[PDB]
Amino acid sequence: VYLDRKLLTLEDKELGSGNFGTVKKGYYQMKKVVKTVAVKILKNEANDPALKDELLAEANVMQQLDNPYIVRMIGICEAESWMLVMEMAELGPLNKYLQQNRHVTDKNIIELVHQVSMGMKYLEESNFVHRDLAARNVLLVTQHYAKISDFGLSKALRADENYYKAQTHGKWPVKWYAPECINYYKFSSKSDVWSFGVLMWEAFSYGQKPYRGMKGSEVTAMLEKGERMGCPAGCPREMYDLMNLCWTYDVENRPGFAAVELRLRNYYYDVVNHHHH
Ligand SMILES: COc1ccc(-c2cc3ncsc3c(O[C@H](C)[C@H]3CNC(=O)C3)n2)cc1OC
């Protein structure tokens, strides 16, 4: 959990940023092997304690998670700034990857979004809400291995509640948010199912931004009229049907991740069967 700064080598180049911090590539000297890592650091000229708490809360969520489809935390270190050391997903965000690799097949996309549903089925069983589930947060280890990242807005649900009630609205990724998040500030695993539907749309659209050219308020007004984004070009009908099911307005009738992962699992095997024929 607490790492040694002398065993960490950071490269100067920045990969990008999350809800909090900036990610740099590094190397960590493990018990024997050297491990390539992604290190989230803080740009905090003012020495604001809030920036440190946000990164530590993020580290606290990751420490409790252990799944093949979730980015693993190696540990933390307090040096030039607080640093959250994670495993490295070399290929990066799924939306940026697909934008640059249009040859990726529908079979390959189903495989990757199914892997995201396995990680989310795990997160839901663990009673954590992601709250920022989007293609930009799905990181590729390989073209055939996706992992969920950025737990900056994530919350451990209370033992007596199935949702997190936000106190402050903030800079919210509204285009990925369910109507109950917008209308009641209530975040559940079912709210994450809604974001997963938007993520699926982004994946089948080869990383295109959802609701293009629309303001957040126009998206809310569209969804309220019962309108949904159209089927992406070349997206299988079974996959567009599943996105629409994720976009069930009423939180009670919306499927949970166990039902979502099963649909994708069965569809993926049908496509694997089609390919062999
Ligand atoms: C080819 O380009 C890239 C290759 C790898 C990365 C990369 C690898 C990586 N591994 C672990 S966290 C991580 C990460 O973080 C991101 C900056 C955000 C997503 N989630 C967060 O928390 C922050 N980015 C990024 C790339 O370009 C944007």
Swiss-Prot record:
<feature type="modified residue" description="Phosphothreonine">
    <location>
        <position position="168"/>
    </location>
</feature>
<feature type="modified residue" description="Phosphotyrosine">
    <location>
        <position position="164"/>
    </location>
</feature>
<comment type="subunit">
    <text>Interacts with LYN; phosphorylates SYK. Interacts with RHOH (phosphorylated); regulates mast cells activation. Interacts with NFAM1 (phosphorylated); probably involved in BCR signaling. Interacts with VAV1 (via SH2 domain); phosphorylates VAV1 upon BCR activation. Interacts with GAB2 (phosphorylated); probably involved in IgE Fc receptor signaling. Interacts (via its SH2 domains) with CD79A (via its phosphorylated ITAM domain); the interaction stimulates SYK autophosphorylation and activation. Interacts with FCRL3.</text>
</comment>
<feature type="modified residue" description="Phosphoserine">
    <location>
        <position position="17"/>
    </location>
</feature>
<comment type="function">
    <text>Non-receptor tyrosine kinase which mediates signal transduction downstream of a variety of transmembrane receptors including classical immunoreceptors like the B-cell receptor (BCR). Regulates several biological processes including innate and adaptive immunity, cell adhesion, osteoclast maturation, platelet activation and vascular development. Assembles into signaling complexes with activated receptors at the plasma membrane via interaction between its SH2 domains and the receptor tyrosine-phosphorylated ITAM domains.</text>
</comment>
<feature type="domain" description="Protein kinase">
    <location>
        <begin position="9"/>
        <end position="269"/>
    </location>
</feature>
<feature type="modified residue" description="Phosphotyrosine">
    <location>
        <position position="269"/>
    </location>
</feature>
<feature type="active site" description="Proton acceptor">
    <location>
        <position position="132"/>
    </location>
</feature>
<comment type="similarity">
    <text>Belongs to the protein kinase superfamily. Tyr protein kinase family. SYK/ZAP-70 subfamily.</text>
</comment>
<feature type="modified residue" description="Phosphotyrosine">
    <location>
        <position position="268"/>
    </location>
</feature>
<feature type="binding site">
    <location>
        <begin position="15"/>
        <end position="23"/>
    </location>
    <ligand>
        <name>ATP</name>
    </ligand>
</feature>
<protein>
    <recommendedName>
        <fullName>Tyrosine-protein kinase SYK</fullName>
    </recommendedName>
</protein>
<feature type="modified residue" description="Phosphotyrosine">
    <location>
        <position position="2"/>
    </location>
</feature>
<comment type="subunit">
    <text>(Microbial infection) Interacts with Epstein-Barr virus LMP2A.</text>
</comment>
<feature type="binding site">
    <location>
        <position position="40"/>
    </location>
    <ligand>
        <name>ATP</name>
    </ligand>
</feature>
<feature type="modified residue" description="Phosphotyrosine">
    <location>
        <position position="267"/>
    </location>
</feature>
<feature type="modified residue" description="Phosphotyrosine">
    <location>
        <position position="184"/>
    </location>
</feature>
<feature type="modified residue" description="Phosphotyrosine">
    <location>
        <position position="122"/>
    </location>
</feature>
<feature type="modified residue" description="Phosphotyrosine">
    <location>
        <position position="145"/>
    </location>
</feature>
<feature type="modified residue" description="Phosphoserine">
    <location>
        <position position="217"/>
    </location>
</feature>
<feature type="modified residue" description="Phosphothreonine">
    <location>
        <position position="220"/>
    </location>
</feature>
<feature type="modified residue" description="Phosphotyrosine; by autocatalysis">
    <location>
        <position position="163"/>
    </location>
</feature>
<feature type="modified residue" description="Phosphothreonine">
    <location>
        <position position="22"/>
    </location>
</feature>
